[model samples]
Target chain A: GHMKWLIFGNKGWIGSMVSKILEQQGEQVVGAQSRADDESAVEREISEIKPDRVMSFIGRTHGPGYSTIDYLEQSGKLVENVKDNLYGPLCLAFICQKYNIHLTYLGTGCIFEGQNNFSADEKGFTENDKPNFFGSSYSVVKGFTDRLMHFFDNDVLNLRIRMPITIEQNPRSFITKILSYSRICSIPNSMTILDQMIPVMIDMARNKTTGTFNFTNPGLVSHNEILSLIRDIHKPNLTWENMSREQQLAILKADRSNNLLNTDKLQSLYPDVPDILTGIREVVSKM
Target chain B: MKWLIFGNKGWIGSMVSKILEQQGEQVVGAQSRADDESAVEREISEIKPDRVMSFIGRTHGPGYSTIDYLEQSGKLVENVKDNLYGPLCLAFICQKYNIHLTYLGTGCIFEGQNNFSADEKGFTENDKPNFFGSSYSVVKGFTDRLMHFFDNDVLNLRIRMPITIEQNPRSFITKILSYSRICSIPNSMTILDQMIPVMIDMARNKTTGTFNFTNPGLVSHNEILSLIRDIHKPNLTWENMSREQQLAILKADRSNNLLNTDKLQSLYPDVPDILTGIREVVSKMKF
Candidate 1:
């Protein structure tokens, strides 16, 4: 009667952590990595593992050094690669519907155009938003595949998480790492990955919630404030003018403006989840 | 000025021909043979055509053999190619709008699936209906590109003669051909090929009139049967088939059912333009 969970991209940092957490909770956990040039390998892995729950964190993760040339060169290949990211979980849901395996898809806030003043909720992107607008091939492909899964009429719970610039256990994320190197004084409005994830995943697994939900630490942060905090903590001689145009573009593209998400649905479902300050403290403690 | 028309195999062939014939004008018509592909060359050599109009039909023509295979192998490619076949002409029209070149497009009657019944004036399907597989794709791509030429906002009447199959001379020809062996069929529904280009030139010059002009004689099978009996004056062995037999034969071979024409009413202005030899026969004949 134990729940069998398959975590795709198991070798990735996020996947590894999530798998470890799920396994420690006495759930059957399996990890899958994409085989060389075998597009359907993930789908085949799901069939072989026959998990009662499938979670996908399979996508091209970005770091600070990412550039336009890198994006242009890899966009098409990444788009093709991510087609199976959604296909694997969607096919699994279709083929094993009688098993009633709860399918959970990890989506990014990058799906939105990021121009609106107000934060978006689950109702904002209700199953019918125009797709493939995101500049990143990764996000465009994910959007397409998400629609494909919906078209297949499968039970899929898509979590649109607007993750902060830092993960709890990994200060190597852009914001923390940049702050560590430059000592910029900045007040971080970031989420500890575990703090943001655990309650949402638990509620998703418990209530069997399907469709999209935005999970983000609700707060705002200014660049100058975040830089000020970094300078106070790391105490390195750094100036904002020292940041290269390339570095600025990367940071701005990833986190210049507020990409805040409406997590009211998540709050209503899991009232115990803490806010950004609690998440920041947890992340800071890990550091 | 003369207009060069392509795809003489389709419904637009007869429509354009009749429009030109009524005005006592001539147009160059072009068509291709299987694997021969000499129509364009011949038109270039003999006719010395300056601009081309394409009514080159697909679903009901030679391309039907490759459609299913093309869809399965590369759907988007097939869609783009199909679109290009029509779009290329629009591009030509855009390039040669000053030269007064125009193209004619034949639309499918089957697009009106459920919202309206098979009446002469009803635009069915309520503007939107659920489409299966590549059906909607074909409609969307062709219609959108065609509108780029016809609609006032994009280009000024560069693409003319958007007629439905109801105005096709071949529709009556095919119906008559099915019962050819049984009747004398004195009314030969044929248009002089020279007339096709005249209509296209007329439309291009903004000498607007009904683009959809059908053959004068629109008679029912039963009426044709009676006329043949009276005219032959010989011991003809022609006998009328039962309604059930005719219905059975029709069901087995017909591709689509309805053709509405409220749009054509704008150009015709008066009903007199549509009433002719075929119309007289259809009106006088009894089933």
Candidate 2:
């Protein structure tokens, strides 16, 4: 019999996509929303939807306007929340260890401090490195639970993906948001949702890497270049104004910065996959 | 106002009695017994004290016994019980800041491992030194909470004292214990008890100095010699055994062998009427 997979936070942006992909692959699938306030409910859900493989993407996520510093003020409480997130999954893993079920955890690149100048490789963000900054509450909790997972004497995998931006199927993704805000904007270099999710799940299912790994598409581009691409597709009856110094500086400070991830390991593992731009184009065509 | 002493076991001893006698003052003392479950209630009954000072001798006493180690194991739990020892006093002090209450907390010379030797002048036995070991737990907790007492703005004095055994009183002290079936041996060349009392008064009076010292006598060799002489005294009929041989061959190691306190520069503006020699003589005469 094929293995069964249980996905947590299955209704979330990434969770929904990952769950759909896993289900399409002919694996038995179960999904649950993990909440801290009601632990009994979470436990009941887990018990009801018992599966062979469990992947947790259940954590407080920060969006475009989220402030890291403000979130840090309530960090201790946030840490308590994150501990709740892992409570069920960790307990389940222990119970299922005898059966040798595979468990996967999804983590973010924000766990890194963005300290190194070059793109961070798999070796640079090893499981052993002390997280440089725990400035955000989410990061603090994530870091704490990540270590706790390793402490468990069973099979588990953690995937630390560093995707800069992914073009989601929904218009709410960063690509759609940028397109809606800036009239003359063109498509820029970015990771396609399929490109980021497919390889990560494939590697996790196949290799069963027991610790953290950095996954991001390689390449960088400017907003102006993206705007130019959009202009090529449709010449709107509008004049394009050059971004002012303040605007240029703000955009640079906000998003157009460097320090992307090095995908050498991912590329080596899956040689047949297309590059970042090809993946982005395919995603845009679907939209 | 008379001081209410919580630890009467040591308070009623000849040393404490002599100190009270010399000061022309009285103390309401409380002590632990095999049946006494609550130290605070016992203190209340014995002393009927309004303003309380706790000097309960609860840590591993200076003796080589397996029972001592076993007793020390319960110290952590004892400290929790003794939380009332500090809490009760803190409550009273908060209400009556002008009462001039003092709590005597003993200091330790050893701080386990991975710490610098407490500076002769700088290390107060009561100071919370960051050393970790099973033996240091109770004292560490007590000292840490004592600091919290100070932080909470309690008007109280903390005295760190290294008391030596009195040569003259050593034999009488041992005899008293022997009569009570408590184990002890006689000793001569002991340090005076008066010195420790003087230091206690200095701390109690809130003399300009934040901390002060008191030592019974200096040389460990002198203490051992005194013990040997007392053992040979008439009616005692003890053997004249070499210290090294007794320690190595018989495994009968005596504690009075190593008792020394560093010099404490007196900060009291006016000296108490009693001298160190007078205090020692009076203590010796009492028993």
Candidate 3:
């Protein structure tokens, strides 16, 4: 595969990170934020870039931003949500397929959170499992496309990312945001370390592999582990209390997506991937 | 005080629209595809409907049809846009306008339920182990619950195998009558006379909550055929198919919910039994 690439939704937080990472990897990367609603602009951009592959980092979030998806989905404002999710990815799927360009979609790991399956001993969901989404428009759209991606697996690869953690002191950063909350659910959940994972995403794309993959690090960590890490490594004795998953969920008008993802599929392909704690250890240290 | 019908040209949409018109209510009709939310929202905002009713459903059975479901992911993606997403979008739009929404949720959502049987006490609003419609019912079940999530703002009507006097491909009676072989499961049903009238009343009341909108009493499949045999054909012939055989005919097992319509009957005690309604329908239909 060629080293040239096109990254859509380039100005978005995660998109910018992915773009910067791709550029750092020495690839000839062209970045473009989709203008307004027309997909034709995307086609024109892609045509000009003529990159070896197209990566869609574009997504619409229901709340403030993807970094803090704590707001319930507003009913009146979901049309844009559906359009952003349905049309953009669909257009890219078509273009990437038609132009024989490999496609990488920045997919969500939020789909599994709304399910009744909350027991800690429960195994993580595999790529083949049915998704249960948090009630937000964001989850619904992502969950729909996760299933839709199966149809275009020949040309598309979906990386199901969740509660992303970064060393950057941004509101969207999990490390920074979790410290703001006084109480957190103790349920084991998945995490993404972009610095380590973005290269793997490209490597998979470069190697010409296509299909859905859980983009989280291997193993699981609870809110307890995350908070304890923040206390120990960063803010010593930061006061926070654990809450039952149900109690926390009951407090929310609409819940956030939280669930363990089976990353054996990814780790099997990339043997060097670290577990959640190991990935977070670096995150905590950077704090 | 105008009623707005979203799927005005559709089978049930036409029925409800005509019913509202006959009732001498001011009515504005809009026909929009479920896939486009903005178009639907624009139409709704322009109409500024006093009461909102959704008669759109993606159905698959003897009459309504779709391709086979090879997997759960395939089944979900196929039906969800019509069954869940569009209707949810409608629900959200209605919520925004402070309007009451009436979603024509199917009683079939209870299909493939396990442990509890209609032979026992009739199922209530909440029961366990409804295994699968896998297609049509699954879609219905999702939106039904989605409506429930919104609670008092929306009314969720669970209509099962509604037998209309008119001969139409989509009508439950016509579809079942067209079948050469049938299974005899004692189940709840809805007569068109009752279904439409109750819908009008429920809308009039601005009613909300999950209610079993079926004939108060139970009727067996064979008992229904007996009515067809006596009134319409007087010698109508049909073969008896086992439940297993009936399920084998479709993509997945169909719902056989025998709803205890106490909630509905409590509201409208004038609602008659299944046999009485069926007899009147056949004779008045003058078949």
Best by lDDT: 3
Q: C-alpha displacement of A60 in model 1, angstroms?
A: 2.3
Candidate 2 stretches with Cα past 4 Å from truth are: A33-49, A62-99, A115-128, A133-135, A147-154, A163-172, A180-192, A199-203, A206-209, A219-258, B1-287
lDDT of 1 at A136: 44
Position B233, candidate 3: lDDT? 81
Relative to the true structure, candidate 1 reaches a TM of 0.43
Candidate 1 structure quality by residue, lDDT tens digits, A3-41:
878776677666677787777777888775544123245
**Model 3 TM-score on chain A:** 0.89
TM-score of the candidate numbered 2? 0.40
TM-score of each: 0.43, 0.40, 0.53
DockQ, candidate 3, comes to 0.02
Residue A42 Cα positional deviation in candidate 3, in Å, after optimal superposition: 41
The Cα local distance difference test for each model comes to 0.44, 0.43, 0.72
Candidate 1 ranges with C-alpha deviation above 4 Å: A33-48, A62-81, A84-99, A115-133, A149-154, A164-172, A180-192, A222-258, B1-287
B1-287 in candidate 3: lDDT tens per residue? Answer: 79887777877778888888888988777666654566777878888888988887656433344323412232334466777777777776787688998888777756432234545656676542253444455446545644654677888888887777888776767777778888777777888766788888888889888887888777777777787777668768889999889767764666775676778878889888887887788777644
Tens digit per residue, CA lDDT, model 2, B1-287: 45555454553244554576577767655454311324434445455443444444343335622113313222323332342234433333332343334444333322322122343233343344332222233333234333332433332233322223442222333433233222222211222353455545643554322232333222222233344345444343324445454445422222321112232433433322222432444344422
